[PDB]
């Protein structure tokens, strides 16, 4: 149980590092400072959304009688935004070409 | 920059409701690009918001004001 | 009670070679019902936020945008 | 050309809502309905083609209603059926329990 909580922390603070990075980049382009609390939030929010990308990806595969998540599963996930789906289908046509 | 493939993987695994559930590789890359987009989006909508309030500092209330719409447009 | 065949007919019209099964149209029906339920809940609260006692098109449109989004698969 | 009754949609909507509703507002509700059926149509095409079937099975729908946010942990599908479905329609969904 404790080992889990430790995984939690390493992760949460991980998504925090990357969040803060992406966050700065947007900050430079747009020319505005993000409060620390701002990035904190964006971070937690990202973390939470993960739970639903997760449980929906689980669902999405196990519906194909499968335990292993494919590019197809991400695409299905991403179907609900035409812009978003267009873009991730692009990223997968780049990634598929190897 | 971006998200570490491994951390994505451990993040997805954390929330799975059945032990045996696992993720392929090119998936993990795409879940990475996807996460990046979600974050750059929250950041930019919040910044948009602040900037349109004639503010230099993007503050937490901006993340909240844009948050509900963000969750919608996205998944 | 259900215009079930009308259900199968609607979908056939959208997805012709998509064939349904069993009672599945009863669940599709239910999803539709619960869609309406949502659109109602939402639209009512949009009126009560408008200081209005009456459901007006503006309210229904707002709602349709949101609930219709919540409805995607 | 085919759809569920304008009148039935109106009935169901003004039931769940319990408020007077402008005629034109039901116009709107009906449009929104045409869109709903269109969308979930394309979806179920997807869910089925995903599990390798050319036919939509019951699990595709439960998957849908789950993905909508209707069927969840604290509110399971059998409940929705129990609450919002006419006795005659739940008998085939809840042959007993």
Tell me briefly what this model is.
The complex is a heterotetramer of chains A (98), B (75), C (73) and D (97). With 98 residues, chain A is mainly alpha-helical.
Question: Any overview of this molecule?
Answer:
Chain D: Belongs to the CENP-T/CNN1 family. Chain D: It is found in: Nucleus; Chromosome, Centromere; Chromosome, Centromere, Kinetochore. Chain D: This is Centromere protein T. The complex is a heterotetramer of chains A (98), B (75), C (73) and D (97). Chain A is 80% helix and 4% strand. Chain A has 98 residues and is mostly helical. Chain A has a single domain, classed as Histone, subunit A, CATH 1.10.20. In chain A, helix 1 (2-30) packs across helix 2 and helix 2 crosses helix 3 (71-77). The longest helix of chain A is centred in the first third of the chain and has 29 residues, at 2-30. Chain B is built from 3 helices and 2 strands; from the N terminus they run αβαβα. The two termini of chain B are 23 Å apart. The relative contact order of chain B is 0.11. With 97 residues, chain D is mainly α. Chain D has one domain (1-97): Histone, subunit A (Orthogonal Bundle). Chain D contains 5 helices and 1 strand. Chain D has helices spanning 6-17, 23-51, 58-68, 77-84, 87-93; one strand spanning 55-56. Chain D is globular, with a radius of gyration of 16 Å.
Instruction: Please work out how many helical segments of chain B DSSP would assign.
Output: 3
Named at the architecture level, the CATH assignment of chain A is: Orthogonal Bundle
In percent, how much strand structure appears in the residues of chain B? 5-15%
Distance between the termini of chain A: 39 Å
* Top CATH class of chain A: Mainly Alpha
The Cα radius of gyration of chain B reads 16 Å
Overall structural domain count of chain A: 1
Instruction: Tell me the series of helices and strands of chain B, N- to C-terminal.
Output: HEHEH
Mass-distribution shape of chain B: elongated
Task: Provide the structure class of chain B.
Answer: mainly alpha
Distance between the termini of chain B: 23 Å
Specify which chain pair forms the largest interface. C-D, 53 and 64 residues
Helix count from the secondary structure assignment of chain A = 4
* Structure summary, number of beta strands of chain A: 2
Shape of chain A: globular
What fraction of residues of chain A sit in β-strands? under 5%
Q: Main β-sheet of chain A: number of strands, strand sense, barrel status? A: none
CATH superfamily of chain A: Histone, subunit A
N-to-C SSE string of chain A, H for helix and E for strand: HEHEHH
- What is the rounded Rg of chain A? 17 Å
Helix-residue proportion of chain A? over 70%
Family (chain D): Belongs to the CENP-T/CNN1 family.
Protein name (chain D): Centromere protein T
Subcellular location (chain D): Nucleus; Chromosome, Centromere; Chromosome, Centromere, Kinetochore
PDB class: dna binding protein
């Amino acid at each position: 149980g404790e080992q889990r909580e430790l995984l939690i922390q390493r992760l949460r603070a991980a998504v925090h590092y990357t969040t803060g990075a992406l966050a700065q980049d947007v900050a430079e382009d747009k020319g505005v400072l993000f409060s620390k609390q701002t990035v904190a939030a964006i971070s937690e929010i990202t973390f939470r959304q993960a739970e639903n990308f997760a449980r929906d990806l689980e669902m999405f595969a196990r519906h194909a009688k499968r335990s292993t998540i494919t590019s197809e599963d991400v695409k299905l996930l991403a179907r609900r935004s035409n812009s978003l789906l267009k873009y991730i289908t692009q990223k997968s046509d780049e990634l598929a070409s190897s | 920059g971006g998200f570490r493939k491994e951390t994505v993987e451990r993040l997805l695994r954390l929330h799975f409701r059945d032990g045996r559930t696992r993720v392929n590789g090119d998936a993990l890359l795409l879940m990475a690009e996807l996460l990046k987009v979600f974050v750059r989006e929250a950041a930019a909508r919040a910044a948009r918001q602040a900037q349109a309030e004639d503010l230099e500092k993007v503050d937490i209330e901006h993340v909240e004001k844009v948050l509900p719409q963000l969750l919608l447009d996205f998944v | 009670t259900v215009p079930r065949g009308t259900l199968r007919k609607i979908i056939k019209k959208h997805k012709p070679h998509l064939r349904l099964a069993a009672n599945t149209d009863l669940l599709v029906h239910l999803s539709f019902l619960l869609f309406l339920h949502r659109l109602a809940e939402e639209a009512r609260t949009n009126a009560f936020e408008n200081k209005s006692k009456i459901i007006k098109p503006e309210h229904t449109i707002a709602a349709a945008k949101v609930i219709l989004k919540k409805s995607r698969g | 050309e085919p759809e569920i009754a304008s009148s039935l949609i109106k009935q169901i909507f003004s039931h769940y809502v319990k408020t007077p509703v402008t005629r034109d507002a039901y116009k709107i509700v009906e449009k929104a309905s045409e869109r709903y059926f269109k969308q979930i149509s394309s979806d179920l095409e997807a869910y089925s083609q995903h599990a390798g079937r050319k036919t939509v099975e019951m699990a595709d729908v439960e998957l849908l209603m789950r993905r909508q946010g209707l069927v969840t942990d604290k509110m399971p599908l059998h409940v929705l059926v129990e609450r919002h479905l006419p006795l005659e329609y739940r008998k085939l969904l809840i042959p007993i329990a």
